[PDB]
């Protein structure tokens, strides 16, 4: 998957 904004 999928990252978050602040990564």
């Amino acid at each position: 998957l999928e990252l978050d904004k602040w990564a």
Partner: antibody
Amino acid sequence: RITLKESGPPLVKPTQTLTLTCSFSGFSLSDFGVGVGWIRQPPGKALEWLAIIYSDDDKRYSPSLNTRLTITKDTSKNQVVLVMTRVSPVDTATYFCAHRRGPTGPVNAMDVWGQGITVTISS
Amino acid sequence: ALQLTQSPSSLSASVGDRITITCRASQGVTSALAWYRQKPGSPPQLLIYDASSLESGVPSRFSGSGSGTEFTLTISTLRPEDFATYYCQQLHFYPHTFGGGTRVDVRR
């Protein structure tokens, strides 16, 4: 400082729709980054992440509850609404809404939570 | 899908004891992991944010460490108000994920 709170019907019937509402006050959804998510906790089990909505409107749901959840924000009231459809006894739990940060690095954690409003399903 | 299964899952300790509870992640989550203490009756409380940062207003006895896949949250000295359930949450991947919970009850 920041305090959110949960509203809605404590008692809900199998099939229908559960509309919960998070009223916060200490921040606005106009502040940049600021997010408000929904976390729910079955009777005596663990926390389960539901969905999150940010200042500028993106929204990520829970892959497993995606086709049943809908998150919105009305910036004039400072409430966040979460609609979860076709509920069943398994959706009986305590639902929390929480405030997440915004870059000033510590936008890394849900720092303040509503107090919780426990919903129970039962026709 | 981002498993993360928190170790020691039901401590049994006294006041003054020193315990270290862990939270494992199936995929690296930078340092985007938070720790909470919930005490029956109410909502989760933030203790550690960004894996190692003590949240303002939280007792100095709580501390956090780790990065990537391993994270720990130590209680230098166990207080009465510490007997509760603790949770870890990563906010690096969507969906944001909570561990199963570790609980520490009074030992007898």
